[PDB]
Design an enzyme around this catalytic site. Structure first.
Site, mmCIF file in Angstrom:
data_model
loop_
_atom_site.group_PDB
_atom_site.id
_atom_site.type_symbol
_atom_site.label_atom_id
_atom_site.label_comp_id
_atom_site.label_asym_id
_atom_site.label_seq_id
_atom_site.Cartn_x
_atom_site.Cartn_y
_atom_site.Cartn_z
ATOM 1 N N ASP A 35 -11.962 34.255 -64.478
ATOM 2 C CA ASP A 35 -10.787 34.889 -65.074
ATOM 3 C C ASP A 35 -10.312 36.022 -64.173
ATOM 4 O O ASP A 35 -10.840 37.135 -64.258
ATOM 5 C CB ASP A 35 -11.164 35.435 -66.451
ATOM 6 C CG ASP A 35 -10.004 36.102 -67.159
ATOM 7 O OD1 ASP A 35 -8.863 35.927 -66.703
ATOM 8 O OD2 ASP A 35 -10.257 36.789 -68.177
ATOM 9 N N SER A 199 7.179 38.276 -57.733
ATOM 10 C CA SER A 199 7.855 37.073 -57.276
ATOM 11 C C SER A 199 9.307 37.390 -56.930
ATOM 12 O O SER A 199 9.944 38.271 -57.524
ATOM 13 C CB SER A 199 7.803 36.000 -58.370
ATOM 14 O OG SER A 199 8.574 34.854 -58.042
#
Length: 330
Positions: A35, A199
């Site tokens: 994770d 992004s």
């Protein structure tokens, strides 16, 4: 040193991925959910409330000659999905894919919430976010990667998740045969303890690319791709009959649909998520309404590049003095 381990979807939908991890002496092998959005290595154990164990493999510290109670240490964690677990702490030897850390904090669950009990395939979590998020008290503990880093050939790990297929986590090296083209690296902020990056934009299907900054986290422990409501609406508007359902809890779409791809920007590069990766199947057995793999982050507070996004790429988690993230097509 290096390590290399195969990671395997837990079900036919890629709801999560499990990786075998050796703990203790003699080894006890547990299948952990790696994770990159949390920083605790915790396991189902001989200390877990018996009624909360249903098929998981447990760690028994009393059977490990290298286990030592970390006296006074406790932990307690709550995840973004509302699940939680807590317990006490041992140190022990932990190996992943041939890479060994001695003295790793292994957090032993005394209590786990219902969704952990109900998932017989996940024996615990191995956190790979930054150690500043580790919940152990009163002495915070380091992640497996943080403990291994100095020994690694290069201070990196890579996630290569498969679509409906196994993939690989590598520690200490970049497998240049595992991706196509070049790896595009992008800046990371560690201020919230995550692999947080920005992004450069997105496209839906064959549509034109929209240049827009989307801050979010690379999180292998989250199944879906959570993005701003504007972006998610633009995606699902391209699917006939798709709608946001308050009763189901997100966007659903007709199971008869063929989904468009979704592209996200990494600097000047582009990662294309095929449409099939966005199909999470019937909302309930036999339903013709299917659950979408791209959902709004509006109720989270952060955008999450979960498995739907990451499995479309070869992803480098670069733990150099200034951490960065790398993405390549594959």
């Amino acid at each position: 040193s290096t390590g290399s381990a195969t990671t395997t979807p837990i079900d036919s939908l890629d709801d999560a991925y499990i990786t075998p991890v050796q703990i203790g002496t003699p080894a006890q092998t547990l299948n952990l959910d790696f994770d990159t959005g949390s920083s605790d290595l915790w396991v189902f154990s001989s200390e877990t409330t018996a009624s909360e164990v249903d098929g998981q493999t447990i760690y028994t510290p009393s059977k490990s000659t290298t286990a030592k109670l970390l006296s006074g240490a406790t932990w307690s964690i709550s995840y973004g999905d509302g699940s939680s677990s807590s317990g006490d702490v041992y140190t022990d030897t932990v190996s992943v894919g041939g890479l060994t850390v001695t003295g790793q904090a292994v957090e032993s669950a005394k209590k786990v919430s219902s969704s952990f009990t109900e998932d017989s395939t996940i024996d615990g979590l191995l956190g790979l976010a930054f150690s500043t998020l580790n919940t152990v008290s009163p002495t915070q503990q380091k992640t497996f990667f943080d403990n291994a880093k100095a020994s690694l050939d290069s201070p990196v790990f890579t996630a290569d998740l498969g679509y409906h297929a196994p993939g690989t986590y590598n520690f200490g090296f970049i497998d240049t045969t595992a991706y196509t083209g070049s790896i595009t690296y992008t800046a990371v902020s560690t201020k919230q303890g995550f692999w947080e990056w920005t992004s450069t934009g997105y496209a839906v299907g064959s549509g034109t690319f929209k240049s827009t900054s989307i801050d979010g986290i690379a999180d292998t422990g989250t199944t879906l791709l959570y993005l701003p409501a504007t972006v998610v609406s633009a995606y699902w508007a391209q699917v006939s009959g798709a709608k946001s359902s308050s009763s189901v809890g997100g966007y659903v779409f007709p199971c008869s649909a063929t989904l468009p791809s979704f592209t996200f920007g990494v600097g000047s590069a582009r990662i294309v998520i095929p449409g099939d990766y966005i199909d999470f199947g019937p909302i309930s057995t036999g339903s013709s309404s299917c659950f979408g793999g791209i959902q709004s982050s509006a109720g989270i507070g952060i955008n999450i590049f979960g498995d739907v996004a990451l499995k479309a790429a070869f992803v480098v988690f670069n733990g150099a003095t200034t951490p960065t993230l790398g993405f390549a097509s594959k």
